[PDB]
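Page header: ASSEMBLY MODEL / two components / 409 residues total.
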Amino acid sequence: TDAKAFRRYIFELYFDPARLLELDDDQHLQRIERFLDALAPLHPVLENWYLCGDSLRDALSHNVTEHRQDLAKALSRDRRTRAVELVLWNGEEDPLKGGLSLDYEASGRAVSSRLQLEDAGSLLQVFDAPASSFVAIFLAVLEIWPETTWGMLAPHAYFVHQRTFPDRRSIGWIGFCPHPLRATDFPAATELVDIPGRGTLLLNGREPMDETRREHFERVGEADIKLMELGYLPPLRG
Amino acid sequence: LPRMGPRLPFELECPPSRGEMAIANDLSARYQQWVTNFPFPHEWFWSGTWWDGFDEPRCTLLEAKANYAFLFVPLLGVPRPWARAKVKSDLLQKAEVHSDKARPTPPVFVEWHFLQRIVYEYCAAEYLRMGLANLKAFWNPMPGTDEHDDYQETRAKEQEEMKRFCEENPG
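Prediction written out in full:
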């Protein structure tokens, strides 16, 4: 449901920088194309994808889902340390209606080789069942990018100020851990989805996390502690 | 409790002094002159990197950013979706390359001074989640602007909030 004051959310997926760097311009563009195809059935705002622009009108000139040949136009290639960079947005201006953008950068550094969607909070406005729909996106990335080493869907307010280990990443509300995990070691309402030989998807509840109610806060904190205790919680810069 | 900005001197251990002034390729221009006291378009070129200003006494490199609020939704606190490419390359990437290009982190600090508040608010949070320890962000607006107005009354409402709290308590 559309609300007046919603929650900013980070939606990030990290990759192995070494392996992803060696993909050429052609392999990158098939990954993004498949990704947009997996997003399309989840909601009508995720069907179309437009290009970035200097103004609002300049950002609606080219539709990369209607004109597919124009997808190659949005891929950069640095001369020193080849680094591809791709930024789209879906075409909605208001986050309260689903305005969201796709930022896909792979330069070869661990911190700079990621994929993210600006303001996952816009998707919370449109998703009836946010849990099933967000898991779909995670499984899409893992299906398309085998180089994935991490993933985190968490409130921006939590992850910046309130997270348990400030020198580490977090699993967030829905995170990907590239290891086999044990349902015993986690809170009861925390449920796991093993990927054959790829890793585990954590879901700290099926209800969207909140940073003002203690029932949600302790659930991902215990989850983060067990991941650190097992040595699977990565640091920020790396 | 927004970060208090120091003042700036004039010009013409801390390595950046091994750089010099170069020419870079007018509300934005005025605000950088007000933050840096650097003449015309001169900027500090050190470590192969551009810096808007340089406080040699305080051993601090300076940068000024103005006119970037139209790229944001002023109440939700996020950039407009179509403007995510500009915010990345202009405000986030250039701020990482700056934190990366400082070596003696004890004496060499970097400061990013924003004319506009919602631009400061977004950047300050995004800089903390990036691991940018030696980069601090300031809402340091040049006078004769709506912002300077909301700046004066914000620090006034802090001394007011501090006036009541302090005289009724130990702290």
